[PDB]
Amino acid sequence: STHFDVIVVGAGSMGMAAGYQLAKQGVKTLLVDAFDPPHTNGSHHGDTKIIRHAYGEGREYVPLALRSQELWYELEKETHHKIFTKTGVLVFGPKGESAFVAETMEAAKEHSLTVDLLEGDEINKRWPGITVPENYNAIFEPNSGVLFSENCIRAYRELAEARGAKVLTHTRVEDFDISPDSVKIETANGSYTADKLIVSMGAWNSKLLSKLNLDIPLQPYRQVVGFFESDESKYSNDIDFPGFMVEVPNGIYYGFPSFGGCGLKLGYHTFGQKIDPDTINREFGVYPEDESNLRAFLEEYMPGANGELKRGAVCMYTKTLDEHFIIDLHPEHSNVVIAAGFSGHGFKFSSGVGEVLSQLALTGKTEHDISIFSINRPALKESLQ
Numbered sequence: 001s002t003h004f005d006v007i008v009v010g011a012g013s014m015g016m017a018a019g020y021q022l023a024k025q026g027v028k029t030l031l032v033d034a035f036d037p038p039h040t041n042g043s044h045h046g047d048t049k050i051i052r053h054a055y056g057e058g059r060e061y062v063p064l065a066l067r068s069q070e071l072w073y074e075l076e077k078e079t080h081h082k083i084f085t086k087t088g089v090l091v092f093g094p095k096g097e098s099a100f101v102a103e104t105m106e107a108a109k110e111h112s113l114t115v116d117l118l119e120g121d122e123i124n125k126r127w128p129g130i131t132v133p134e135n136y137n138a139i140f141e142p143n144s145g146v147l148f149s150e151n152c153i154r155a156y157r158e159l160a161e162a163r164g165a166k167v168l169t170h171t172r173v174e175d176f177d178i179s180p181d182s183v184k185i186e187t188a189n190g191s192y193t194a195d196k197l198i199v200s201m202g203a204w205n206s207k208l209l210s211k212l213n214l215d216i217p218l219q220p221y222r223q224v225v226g227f228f229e230s231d232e233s234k235y236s237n238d239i240d241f242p243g244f245m246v247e248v249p250n251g252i253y254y255g256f257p258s259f260g261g262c263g264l265k266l267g268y269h270t271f272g273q274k275i276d277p278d279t280i281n282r283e284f285g286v287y288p289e290d291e292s293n294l295r296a297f298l299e300e301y302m303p304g305a306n307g308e309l310k311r312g313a314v315c316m317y318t319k320t321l322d323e324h325f326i327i328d329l330h331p332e333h334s335n336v337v338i339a340a341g342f343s344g345h346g347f348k349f350s351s352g353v354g355e356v357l358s359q360l361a362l363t364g365k366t367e368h369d370i371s372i373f374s375i376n377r378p379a380l381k382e383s384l385q
């Protein structure tokens, strides 16, 4: 018998940030999650995530990245959990052969970001442990870095709960009932109503948005990461080894310096298995490519970080056809906000997205420019049932 102002379904990266923004304003909020965030069944575990400002996926993401960076610094001051370390982020690739490196460079120029440009041997010299061909160029962003994702979610949850937000864990939302003046969710643990709904179920958006009469192509992918024993005199965060996202002939890779001897962490971005979030095999090593795709990169570009595998993790990306996000009101219901398809690069923006989602839910509009994330854009291929 408890009505809420707002209900957030999926209290992960995006939902928990929204819950915190709403709670902070005194909005009576209920967050419902299938597990107990932060957990290891969605897209936010694996300990760390890169935050970059000069944006290779699109210069139009810069303001949101800069706003998110400021919000992460604010969160750092508000909690005892560690949130951000300024490792800097290095982007490199073959000169003239990487659209990713080119747009990162254009994005930095267009928004006057602070970056260092270097090439070939200058890269190897500046960061012992990296070995790239002489025809490679790079752009280094010293002020971006690494976020401790599980800590971010845990901190937003503690702060939101302290202000009255309620979080119903281990509860799967199974259906929705939307009316012009209210929303209702159905779960095995009971039904709940509110004035507004925010839907942010991550990989499960690909299976449950149909319950809101939405037919949007969303493909979940199994993406693994590995931590490798490394030469700490070269790859440690203590000796300024940077976070990185680079483009090589066979694709894009991203990584993190070793923190407190945990080993260098690496992931292969461009390849992953197409899967269903409810049947995905979350054990690292069950496919030979899990470990082999990573060592293929390490032995060539960071030879001293190709030691024993210390830990593996299996997480998911949910891609849209254009790999841009979906953040918008439901086309048929202004009282329903959708956050989906972060396509493998949404964590860094979760603080800013939480702000956008709270504004959309409370006012139906946002001060941020989110036109490129419209649920009505052609490149998405969106429609109703």
Ligand SMILES: *Cc1cc2c(cc1C)nc1c(=O)[nH]c(=O)nc-1n2C[C@H](O)[C@H](O)[C@H](O)COP(=O)(O)OP(=O)(O)OC[C@H]1O[C@@H](n2cnc3c(N)ncnc32)[C@H](O)[C@@H]1O
Pocket: 009, 010, 011, 012, 013, 014, 015, 032, 033, 034, 035, 037, 041, 042, 043, 044, 046, 048, 049, 050, 051, 171, 172, 173, 174, 200, 201, 202, 203, 204, 208, 223, 224, 225, 254, 267, 315, 316, 317, 339, 340, 342, 343, 344, 345, 346, 347, 348, 349
């Ligand atoms: C997987 C991955 C992603 C990733 C990355 C490396 C890997 C291996 N590296 C990144 C990086 O360096 N920088 C960056 O900015 N992003 C990076 N990413 C992507 C990022 O992690 C994802 O885009 C982000 O986490 C997406 O957030 P979202 O909030 O969409 O997803 P979630 O955190 O998984 O939360 C969804 C929640 O909803 C719940 N759920 C699901 N179904 C239900 C139902 N039916 N009822 C209630 N709750 C539901 C989940 O339990 C989950 O908590």
Ligand SMILES: [Cl-]
Pocket: 043, 316, 317, 318, 319, 341, 342, 343, 344, 345, 346
């Ligand atoms: Cl994603």
